[PDB]
Amino acid sequence: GIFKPEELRQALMPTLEALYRQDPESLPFRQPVDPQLLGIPDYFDIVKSPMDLSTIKRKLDTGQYQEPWQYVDDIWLMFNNAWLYNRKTSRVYKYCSKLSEVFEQEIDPVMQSLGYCCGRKLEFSPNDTLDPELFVECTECGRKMHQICVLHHEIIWPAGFVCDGCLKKSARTRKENKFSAKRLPSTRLGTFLENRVNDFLRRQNHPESGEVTVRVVHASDKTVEVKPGMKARFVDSGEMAESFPYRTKALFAFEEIDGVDLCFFGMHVQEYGSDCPPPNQRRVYISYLDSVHFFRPKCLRTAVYHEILIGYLEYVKKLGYTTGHIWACPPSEGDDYIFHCHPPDQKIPKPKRLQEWFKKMLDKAVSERIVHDYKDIFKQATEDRSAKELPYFEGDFWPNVLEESILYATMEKHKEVFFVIRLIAGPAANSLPPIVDPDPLIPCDLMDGRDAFLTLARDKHLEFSSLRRAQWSTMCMLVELHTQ
């Protein structure tokens, strides 16, 4: 036992009286449902565990609740029975919804006064059913708390969870989390980007901004093989190379928010080096860009994205990559992209908004004299003067759509989607030294393309749907990156 029974009764009884005072919303909930009297004989075929305010009052008054979550569980059983049995458009359904809003406001401050994370009944995002959020138990006081509220990971703290209350009471502080973003192995690329971001943020000197970390978490050597269609026409003759080698890299940016890691940006790139045959030579392809919109302050979010993306273009330019490519079309309605379960209010941008966003960033990159020029693939193709000449990237649009044929008219209708970004133009691009990546390979199967991370996130309910859930998913993804 944690609580003297009378203490639990005095704390919780006012939240029950708050529901009882709601008239008419509590009237269907004050007494056990009597299916005969109400003419609803199928009630007990649908509702296996009836619950009502008078039963909860008796359990409270007789000391039947040993800890407050058993009370919260009975309140939500009552709400869920009503939402299950009654139609969404029915009076009882709407009364139930109103009572659940009254309960959430009342129970929050009570559960926090009793030393709990919150008083919320929490379930994951959407076989008609939702998975419940997990609890951990303080080894010192025995209070149960949301795993995600207190960010307790068994790998980081194997001896068990100790709540803030028990740590203060014993003049102790939580053992440092060494599975941090900052402690991921550093790369030259990562250091360059993060130094750019933090320099900008220090110039703004805004009180809300946290330190940013940028880490390369995957680097491996791959090959894209030419598809059979285009292999027939161009490769089979010996006119075009059969496969193009590249380095695939994955990087993430993390911000300190409320003193813990938050992963807010993700990037996959394909890097076609100087020993890669034309027409891919000295080209970089940004496969996927994703974000979780919790960057603080929100007034500097776009500018921080600019520092990372303009920074990457500056870094590859200096090494001797001439051209950048971005496939600027949104993901399809149903595809998570990099981060599983975005906030519902982080809307996939419309094509026009996405194109305009990328245009503004590249204009900044022109002002800084990092980008020479940028145009749609149509103008750049006209200006370069066959289909053999098209840069051919793993998982890109053009290798797919060129199979549908087996070009000129197709580019014009999809011109605004494909940005070509000139980093090095003219004679400067003729007599460059070899491209030598000063960072080693980083083997990491989890970050080998975007699917392994999406699979882990689905399997373990690592959502980025709220700040608190994004903070847990960041902590979990960092433990996995640290223990490969």
Binding region for ligand C0C (CB under 6 A) = 289-291, 305, 330-331, 336-337, 342, 344, 346-349, 353-354, 357
Q: How many CA atoms lie within 13 A of 410 on its CB side?
A: 10
Shortest distance, CB of residue 359 to ligand C0C, whole angstroms? 11
Structure tokens at 444: 């990491």
Q: Name which of Zn ion, ligand C0C, none residue 344 binds, using a CB cut-off of 5 to 8 Å depending on partner kind.
A: ligand C0C
Shortest distance, CB of residue 49 to Zn ion, whole angstroms? 23
Helix (H) or strand (E) holding 100: helix 91-113
**215 by DSSP, 3-state: which?**
strand
Residue partners of 409: CB distance under 8 A and separation at least 6: none
- 302 labelled as ligand-binding? yes
Indicate the residue among 140 and 373 with the shorter CB distance to Zn ion.
Answer: 140
Helix (H) or strand (E) holding 466: none
Q: Name which of Zn ion, ligand C0C, none residue 149 binds, using a CB cut-off of 5 to 8 Å depending on partner kind.
A: Zn ion
Shortest distance, CB of residue 287 to ligand C0C, whole angstroms? 12
Residue partners of 44: CB distance under 8 A and separation at least 6: 35, 50
Structure tokens at 181: 């973003």
Indicate the residue among 20 and 288 with the shorter CB distance to ligand C0C.
Answer: 288
- 21 labelled as ligand-binding? no
Is the CA virtual torsion 347, 307, 309, 328 positive or negative?
Answer: positive
Strands 373-376 and 323-327: unpaired
Residues paired with 270 in a beta bridge: 248, 285
221 residue type, one letter: D
Indicate the residue among 157 and 357 with the shorter CB distance to ligand C0C.
Answer: 357
Give the integer Cα–Cα distance in Å for 277 and 465. Answer: 43
Indicate the residue among 168 and 350 with the shorter CB distance to ligand C0C.
Answer: 350
Indicate the residue among 167 and 446 with the shorter CB distance to Zn ion.
Answer: 167
Indicate the residue among 152 and 296 with the shorter CB distance to Zn ion.
Answer: 152
Shortest distance, CB of residue 344 to ligand C0C, whole angstroms? 5
Place of tokens 């803030």: 164
- 290 labelled as ligand-binding? yes
Answer for which of 51, 149, 371, 423 binds Zn ion (CB under 5 A) is 149
Structure tokens at 295: 């960057």
Residue 245, judged by CB atoms within 10 A of its CB (0-12, 13-18, 19+), counts as middle
- 77 labelled as ligand-binding? no
Using CB under 5 A as the criterion, what x/- string covers residues 107-146 for binding Zn ion? ----------xx-------------------x-xx----x
Give the integer Cα–Cα distance in Å for 468 and 346. Answer: 15
- 386 labelled as ligand-binding? no
Indicate the residue among 226 and 338 with the shorter CB distance to ligand C0C.
Answer: 338
Q: State which residue has the least CB distance to ligand C0C.
A: 291
**94 by DSSP, 3-state: which?**
helix
Using CB under 5 A as the criterion, what x/- string covers residues 156-195 for binding Zn ion? -------x--x-----------------------------
Give the integer Cα–Cα distance in Å for 355 and 360. Answer: 9
Q: Name which of Zn ion, ligand C0C, none residue 138 binds, using a CB cut-off of 5 to 8 Å depending on partner kind.
A: Zn ion
> How many other C-beta atoms lie within 10 A of the C-beta of residue 127?
3
Place of tokens 């939702």: 130
- 289 labelled as ligand-binding? yes
Shortest distance, CB of residue 195 to ligand C0C, whole angstroms? 20
Strands 283-291 and 323-327: parallel
Q: How many CA atoms lie within 13 A of 451 on its CB side?
A: 1
Using CB under 5 A as the criterion, what x/- string covers residues 382-421 for binding Zn ion? ----------------------------------------
Interface segment toward Zn ion; rule CB under 5 A; list 27-35, 149-157, 359-367, 395-403 = 149-157
Residues 266-325 interacting with Zn ion (rule: CB under 5 A): none
Give the integer Cα–Cα distance in Å for 436 and 88. Answer: 63
* Number of residues forming the site for Zn ion (CB under 5 A): 9
Residues paired with 256 in a beta bridge: 261
Q: Tell me the binding residues.
A: 289-291, 301-302, 348, 353, 357
Residues that bind Zn ion (CB under 5 A): 117-118, 138, 140-141, 146, 149, 163, 166
Q: Tell me the binding residues for acetyl-CoA.
A: 289-291, 301-302, 348, 353, 357
